[PDB]
Amino acid sequence: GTSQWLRKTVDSAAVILFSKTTCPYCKKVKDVLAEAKIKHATIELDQLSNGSAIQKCLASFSKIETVPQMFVRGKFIGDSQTVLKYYSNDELAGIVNESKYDYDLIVIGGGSGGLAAGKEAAKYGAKTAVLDYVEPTPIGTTWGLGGTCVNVGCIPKKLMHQAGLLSHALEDAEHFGWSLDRSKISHNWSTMVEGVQSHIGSLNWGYKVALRDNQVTYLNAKGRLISPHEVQITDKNQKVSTITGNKIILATGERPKYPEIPGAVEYGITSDDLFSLPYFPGKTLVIGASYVALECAGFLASLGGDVTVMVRSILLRGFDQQMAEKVGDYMENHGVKFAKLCVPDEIKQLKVVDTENNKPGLLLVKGHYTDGKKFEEEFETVIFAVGREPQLSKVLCETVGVKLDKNGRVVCTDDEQTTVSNVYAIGDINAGKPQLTPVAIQAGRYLARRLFAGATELTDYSNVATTVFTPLEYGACGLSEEDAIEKYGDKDIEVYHSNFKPLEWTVAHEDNVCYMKLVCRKSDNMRVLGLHVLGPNAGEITQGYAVAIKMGATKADFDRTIGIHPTCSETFTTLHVTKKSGVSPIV
Amino acid sequence: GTSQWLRKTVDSAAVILFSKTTCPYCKKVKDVLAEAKIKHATIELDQLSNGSAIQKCLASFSKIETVPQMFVRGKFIGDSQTVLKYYSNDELAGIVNESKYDYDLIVIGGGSGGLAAGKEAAKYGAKTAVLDYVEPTPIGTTWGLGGTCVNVGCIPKKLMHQAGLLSHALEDAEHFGWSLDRSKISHNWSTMVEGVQSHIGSLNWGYKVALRDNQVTYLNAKGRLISPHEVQITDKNQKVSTITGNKIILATGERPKYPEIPGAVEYGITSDDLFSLPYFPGKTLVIGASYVALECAGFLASLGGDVTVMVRSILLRGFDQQMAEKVGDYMENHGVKFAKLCVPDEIKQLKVVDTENNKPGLLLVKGHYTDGKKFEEEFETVIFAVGREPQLSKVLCETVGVKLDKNGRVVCTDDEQTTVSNVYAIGDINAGKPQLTPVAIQAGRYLARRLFAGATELTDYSNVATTVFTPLEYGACGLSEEDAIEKYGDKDIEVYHSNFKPLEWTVAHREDNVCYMKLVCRKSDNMRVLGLHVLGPNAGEITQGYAVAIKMGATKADFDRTIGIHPTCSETFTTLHVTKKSGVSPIV
Ligand SMILES: Cc1cc2nc3c(=O)[nH]c(=O)nc-3n(C[C@H](O)[C@H](O)[C@H](O)COP(=O)(O)OP(=O)(O)OC[C@H]3O[C@@H](n4cnc5c(N)ncnc54)[C@H](O)[C@@H]3O)c2cc1C
Ligand SMILES: Cc1cc2nc3c(=O)[nH]c(=O)nc-3n(C[C@H](O)[C@H](O)[C@H](O)COP(=O)(O)OP(=O)(O)OC[C@H]3O[C@@H](n4cnc5c(N)ncnc54)[C@H](O)[C@@H]3O)c2cc1C
Numbered sequence A: 001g002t003s004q005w006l007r008k009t010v011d012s013a014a015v016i017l018f019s020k021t022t023c024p025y026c027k028k029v030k031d032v033l034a035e036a037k038i039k040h041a042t043i044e045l046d047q048l049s050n051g052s053a054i055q056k057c058l059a060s061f062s063k064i065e066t067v068p069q070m071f072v073r074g075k076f077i078g079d080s081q082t083v084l085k086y087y088s089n090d091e092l093a094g095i096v097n098e099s100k101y102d103y104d105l106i107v108i109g110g111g112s113g114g115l116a117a118g119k120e121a122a123k124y125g126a127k128t129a130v131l132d133y134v135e136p137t138p139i140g141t142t143w144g145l146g147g148t149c150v151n152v153g154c155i156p157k158k159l160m161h162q163a164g165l166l167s168h169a170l171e172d173a174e175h176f177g178w179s180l181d182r183s184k185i186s187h188n189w190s191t192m193v194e195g196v197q198s199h200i201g202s203l204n205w206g207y208k209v210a211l212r213d214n215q216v217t218y219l220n221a222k223g224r225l226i227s228p229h230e231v232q233i234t235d236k237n238q239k240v241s242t243i244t245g246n247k248i249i250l251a252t253g254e255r256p257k258y259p260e261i262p263g264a265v266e267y268g269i270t271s272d273d274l275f276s277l278p279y280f281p282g283k284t285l286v287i288g289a290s291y292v293a294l295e296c297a298g299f300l301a302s303l304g305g306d307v308t309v310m311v312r313s314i315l316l317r318g319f320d321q322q323m324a325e326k327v328g329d330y331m332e333n334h335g336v337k338f339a340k341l342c343v344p345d346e347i348k349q350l351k352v353v354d355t356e357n358n359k360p361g362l363l364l365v366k367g368h369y370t371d372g373k374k375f376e377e378e379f380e381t382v383i384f385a386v387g388r389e390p391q392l393s394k395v396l397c398e399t400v401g402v403k404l405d406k407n408g409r410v411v412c413t414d415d416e417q418t419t420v421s422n423v424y425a426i427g428d429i430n431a432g433k434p435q436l437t438p439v440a441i442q443a444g445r446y447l448a449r450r451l452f453a454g455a456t457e458l459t460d461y462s463n464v465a466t467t468v469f470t471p472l473e474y475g476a477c478g479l480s481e482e483d484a485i486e487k488y489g490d491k492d493i494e495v496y497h498s499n500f501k502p503l504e505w506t507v508a509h510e511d512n513v514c515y516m517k518l519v520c521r522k523s524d525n526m527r528v529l530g531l532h533v534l535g536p537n538a539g540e541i542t543q544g545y546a547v548a549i550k551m552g553a554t555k556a557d558f559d560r561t562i563g564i565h566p567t568c569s570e571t572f573t574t575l576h577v578t579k580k581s582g583v584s585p586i587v
Numbered sequence B: 001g002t003s004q005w006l007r008k009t010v011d012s013a014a015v016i017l018f019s020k021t022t023c024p025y026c027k028k029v030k031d032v033l034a035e036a037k038i039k040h041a042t043i044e045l046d047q048l049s050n051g052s053a054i055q056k057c058l059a060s061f062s063k064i065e066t067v068p069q070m071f072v073r074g075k076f077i078g079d080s081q082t083v084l085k086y087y088s089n090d091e092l093a094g095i096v097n098e099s100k101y102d103y104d105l106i107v108i109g110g111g112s113g114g115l116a117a118g119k120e121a122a123k124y125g126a127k128t129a130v131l132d133y134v135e136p137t138p139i140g141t142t143w144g145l146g147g148t149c150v151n152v153g154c155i156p157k158k159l160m161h162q163a164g165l166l167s168h169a170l171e172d173a174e175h176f177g178w179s180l181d182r183s184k185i186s187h188n189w190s191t192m193v194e195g196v197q198s199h200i201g202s203l204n205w206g207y208k209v210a211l212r213d214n215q216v217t218y219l220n221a222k223g224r225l226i227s228p229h230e231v232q233i234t235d236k237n238q239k240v241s242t243i244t245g246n247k248i249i250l251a252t253g254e255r256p257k258y259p260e261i262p263g264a265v266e267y268g269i270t271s272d273d274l275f276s277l278p279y280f281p282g283k284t285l286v287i288g289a290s291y292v293a294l295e296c297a298g299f300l301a302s303l304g305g306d307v308t309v310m311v312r313s314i315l316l317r318g319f320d321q322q323m324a325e326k327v328g329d330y331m332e333n334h335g336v337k338f339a340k341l342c343v344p345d346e347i348k349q350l351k352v353v354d355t356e357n358n359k360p361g362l363l364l365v366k367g368h369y370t371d372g373k374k375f376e377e378e379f380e381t382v383i384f385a386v387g388r389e390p391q392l393s394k395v396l397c398e399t400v401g402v403k404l405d406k407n408g409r410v411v412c413t414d415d416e417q418t419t420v421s422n423v424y425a426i427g428d429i430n431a432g433k434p435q436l437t438p439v440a441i442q443a444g445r446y447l448a449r450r451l452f453a454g455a456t457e458l459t460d461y462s463n464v465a466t467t468v469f470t471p472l473e474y475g476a477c478g479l480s481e482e483d484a485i486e487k488y489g490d491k492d493i494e495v496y497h498s499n500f501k502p503l504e505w506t507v508a509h510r511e512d513n514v515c516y517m518k519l520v521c522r523k524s525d526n527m528r529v530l531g532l533h534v535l536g537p538n539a540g541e542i543t544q545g546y547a548v549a550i551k552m553g554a555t556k557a558d559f560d561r562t563i564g565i566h567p568t569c570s571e572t573f574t575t576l577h578v579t580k581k582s583g584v585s586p587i588v
């Protein structure tokens, strides 16, 4: 009912005003709170369909049914006369700061989700702390505020992908009439890294500025939850102390795994080290087959590197395997070598990294194939991309009572609540959720609004679109073909597909490598279950269709919509060849 | 209802079989027709909701109610035993080819719409002819099969746009670590024209191959409709003759306009000439302010040219004007000069075009500003982009009875039918329709299916998305902000907007707050998205997908609950929150 919503909202909000837009008494109270620099949530009752019933329920706390009514941390404070009495008697600031705890909210983790949750909470008057610490990699690499995406993830990865894309831009320019000679142009790794790191630095600073301008307390400290409301923090100087908070948000993310083989930790690196590496990696082996592995190998090859990928079984496990194979075939034809069906056994050091002259070392990699033959080859750099994992045993004392799953991620309700009722988890550590930066940001902002502004909207985790930024990009939204066939049966699935050629590729001189498909359910009006595209700018192509899939688009919706010409994306609006027909999809 | 549909379908279809998927007698008839290379439409009665009623109405034509039933040009031909008799007796070929007319379908015009209509019709057994002729420009330019888009429109202009985009890619490469020096690289116009024209030639050839492989008769001839079923054709040798057809599709498109001033036709050019010009235009004046004018001026400046645009009043009349101004401001900041509020009065010739040394001429342009002050400046090339118009007085004898509107376009019903019942019109000459290549293609294909395969689906001309390929691209779908406010009033319209910066622009040191997007929404209809607008790179790829959601009636809530893809430009549409009425700044 309305009544129990109102109780949760009053119990949880830090400072909240129940108001009406046309009442000059509420306006007087608003302008008072603004002058006093008091931030607060506002619930305009004349804009809610059942505002009348809420007014009646307020009296259960305040014994009045009029507006405005101000509350602070679950307690009714007063109407217009009473609030102005406190203001003119210099008693207001003390009353709005009265709290059982040091903070209304403590966020452990200053990354994609945690910074978004903390900033949104502060907008409603929640007194908020954000804790962030970066544990250094085995070789000592560290970085600033903002999380995995900002520092060692989406941002530097896509900037180095762009540096690689520009190599083919240089090649194409000749065919379009420009006088340069591609074969006499080379790439400088450290010039690239300096520009990438300068941009990352501007983001570290921007987040510190944003927290200060929202009155958020930023602590560069390692946090550990030792009881439901107590966080122990450890300083850069090993000073230990305890702060208290009403609500706690866990948002500490993951770090790369290493295989348990000799030499891995000592002599290899991960993506954590790659994006600030002060020397060109040289001849490189990438071990693994995830989107991180393939994206990194792809741009290293495009910058002119000698690059090999060691694949245990398949590419992109969990993605549509037809598409995954097309991705890998393109890379193999464009200068990435693959050691297929192969695992490593040991990494042996032949030459130590020369920090002084800014040169890599030299390594001997020993491994074996599934047919039993041995692998043995020398590389200057070895990069492990074999998955990521959280380390919540560092963050969470067992006695607090927060349940984890077999993988060590937090088990949450559909509103991010843990098994401890004031403790929530968002981002990559929330078990079962897509591990993506815009998912973490939406979860964090929406959760802050439910805690401190009386919102009810949940985050929707279904049909979240993705893009893999390999040399030829792969965008997807919804089910793979194999998952749909498993779920519904082969006779209830129809697949429309086509090759295509970007117009930009005609003058630049391949005809049939770009490819797209719609996987559809026959018995549900040909509903689009999944969309897949391999081609340039695949993330821009895919994004808009994710809205239509969210709304339940059918094939007839795609047919009746008209294309924009000339584009790659328009090919989705005229698809007609089915896989069951056996007709070729080539252009 | 059903009976009126069945009569229209039987009267119009060239060759059609009424069938069921489970009937082995129907399968035997299908096999005979395929072996005799007889193409036909097929309607599978067991797959239609009212298949039982259709089966019963068939008796009004054939006096039977079973399947299969074969018809040819409105006449019942027979059941399974009868079709096999004709086949065994070598009588079937002559039956299926019997006609009052030379062709089931004559398409006048071999462009985007006409080629699509003709190929689709031939798939259902319609005996089809496609007529195409290119009247040369005043200086003599002509080109091959395929229409305006293929030869002198979307295809060459986007390729030249891409050559222009690559100049900034060469600049950006230095910041991302590559060793080149952009300052020492120049552009060769004729090398780019040769590559563009080689691709256009492959399209000309590909369409001739497609018509041959579909058994469509291609006539390189100028057509004139002289009665409802008679088309007069004129040869390249000026031989005149008459062919007849049951259905007629008019698909002749438009050509560029010239202003009525001295020297315009003699010494200027249009887009028709630009895309195959053998020499670089040099210092260029573009007169006009359409998307054609701005796209051409944009790429010429990026290829190193000294370019001025003469604007009579505003940019992009009929497009959202906040967006049009941001487009123009970006071009003016990046090396396009504008002569604002200005029109030309005369072009004088100072040098003839130098065909020997492959060089432009030289012209003196005189004009005046709206306050009366004078304009006078020299240019090597003057391009007119002041609109396009059809020439239907050449295509259509007045006595046929096809009604035209005040602009000379064809007045059609919602199924493309003109005021003459067997005559239809598609593409740019269809009055009131968006003038775009994918619209012409959808209209031609859907019409051919209704004429020859019993389809009922109409083309939907509402909320068709567009993209202007200026140096910074502008994509749009739906109403402009000013049209939304005019239609619903200011109090019922909410606008969400934001600047943004492509991630690719950060290390390249490009501008922070020039790219821009907005959603124009209707408050009283669950915040329905009435219009979407984006200025930024790859704007056509950004916009296309959202056109499906707008077709389905997307609201602001649907954008909010959808999660973004990171890092992209398009994801900024999923988190918009600043409203124009709040007064809050949209900068990042
Ligand atoms: C190479 C790579 C590329 C990626 N590319 C993309 C992409 O293109 N698009 C996309 O959507 N996603 C991408 N991702 C995923 C994206 O980075 C993550 O989903 C996102 O960063 C998760 O956000 P988060 O808030 O859960 O955690 P994080 O961003 O990892 O932030 C958690 C923070 O908490 C800190 N912390 C940990 N323990 C403590 C403690 N005890 N006390 C204090 N602070 C602590 C961590 O050091 C870190 O700073 C990529 C990931 C990688 C590794
Ligand atoms: C510079 C420019 C750029 C454009 N860019 C785009 C773009 O990016 N995207 C987009 O969607 N649209 C674009 N367009 C619009 C697009 O070209 C048209 O909407 C489309 O070509 C219209 O097709 P149509 O079939 O109506 O006519 P057309 O393609 O013009 O074909 C008509 C054909 O009929 C021929 N013909 C004329 N009279 C006769 C006759 N009597 N007998 C026989 N044949 C005859 C003509 O010579 C021509 O070949 C652009 C147009 C221009 C001018």
Ligand SMILES: COCC(=O)NCc1ccccc1
Binding pocket: A291, A318, A319, A434, A435, A436, A466, A467, A468
């Ligand atoms: C960059 O995209 C990485 C990602 O994790 N995308 C979502 C996904 C979920 C489940 C299986 C495959 C993919």
Ligand SMILES: COCC(=O)NCc1ccccc1
Binding pocket: A311, A313, A314, A315, A325, A328, A329, A332, A338, A340, A341
């Ligand atoms: C079933 O997968 C067999 C396999 O060897 N996959 C690895 C790979 C495939 C295609 C291109 C590059 C690498």
Ligand SMILES: COCC(=O)NCc1ccccc1
Binding pocket: B311, B313, B314, B315, B325, B328, B329, B332, B338, B340, B341
């Ligand atoms: C009302 O419009 C007045 C006008 O002069 N528009 C032309 C123009 C505007 C912005 C940049 C370049 C040209």
Ligand SMILES: COCC(=O)NCc1ccccc1
Binding pocket: B291, B317, B318, B319, B434, B435, B436, B466, B467, B468
């Ligand atoms: C009001 O204009 C609507 C329209 O669709 N105009 C045709 C066109 C649009 C965009 C780019 C090029 C051409």
